[PDB]
């Protein structure tokens, strides 16, 4: 689990969104596993605006933050797992690292702020849903 709280937005994995998120929907995209809902209180997370490929992510299944190199946001095949079917996911970045389903929502951060959230895993890779292209999270 986990979310990004920027301005009056809450950013979550689409597959973990709650009824409240859907009842306060701003934007969602199945292809990216992202959903954004509106918040009553202002958040303080800063979204990275950059093309960094190094950062640190939170892995809840190890209670650890790991430094990682990560790839460019791309359209990648995600294999079937115990709880989820095989599908293509867009705006996905991969790193070599540990990820289990319950790690979804863990923050990836660089020196510029939040890059994205854990979204996929398998075969010793961790996949992150990028948010750095969603420039509107910074306004309105
Ligand atoms: C961090 O995510 C995973 C790690 C391992 C296996 C599957 C997943 C996953 N796939 N879709 C959602 O979670
Ligand atoms: Zn950066």
From Swiss-Prot:
Active-site residues per Swiss-Prot or TrEMBL entry: 15, 33, 104
Binding site for Zn(2+) 1: 50, 52, 110, 112
Catalytically driven reaction(s): Selective cleavage of Tyr-|-Gly bond in the picornavirus polyprotein
General function of this protein: Cysteine protease that cleaves viral polyprotein and specific host proteins. It is responsible for the autocatalytic cleavage between the P1 and P2 regions, which is the first cleavage occurring in the polyprotein. Also cleaves the host translation initiation factor EIF4G1, in order to shut down the capped cellular mRNA translation. Inhibits the host nucleus-cytoplasm protein and RNA trafficking by cleaving host members of the nuclear pores. Counteracts stress granule formation probably by antagonizing its assembly or promoting its dissassembly.
Known partners and oligomeric status: Homodimer.
Name this protein carries in UniProt: Protease 2A
The species this protein was found in: Coxsackievirus A16 (strain G-10)
Organism taxonomic ancestry: Viruses, Riboviria, Orthornavirae, Pisuviricota, Pisoniviricetes
Residue range from the parent sequence: 869 to 1008 of 2193
């Amino acid at each position: 689990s986990g979310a990004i709280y920027v301005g009056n937005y809450r950013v979550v994995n689409r597959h973990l969104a709650t009824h409240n998120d859907w009842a306060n929907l701003v934007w969602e995209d199945s292809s990216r596993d992202l959903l954004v809902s509106s918040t009553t209180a202002q958040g303080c997370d800063t979204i990275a605006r950059c093309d960094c490929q190094t950062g640190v992510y939170y892995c809840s299944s190890r209670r650890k933050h790991y430094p990682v190199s990560f790839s460019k946001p791309s359209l990648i095949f995600v294999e079937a797992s115990e709880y989820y079917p095989a599908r293509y996911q867009s705006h996905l970045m991969l790193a070599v690292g540990h990820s289990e389903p319950g790690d979804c929502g863990g923050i990836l951060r660089c020196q510029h702020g939040v890059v994205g959230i854990v979204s996929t895993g398998g075969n010793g890779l961790v996949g992150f849903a990028d948010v750095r292209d969603l420039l509107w999270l910074d306004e309105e």
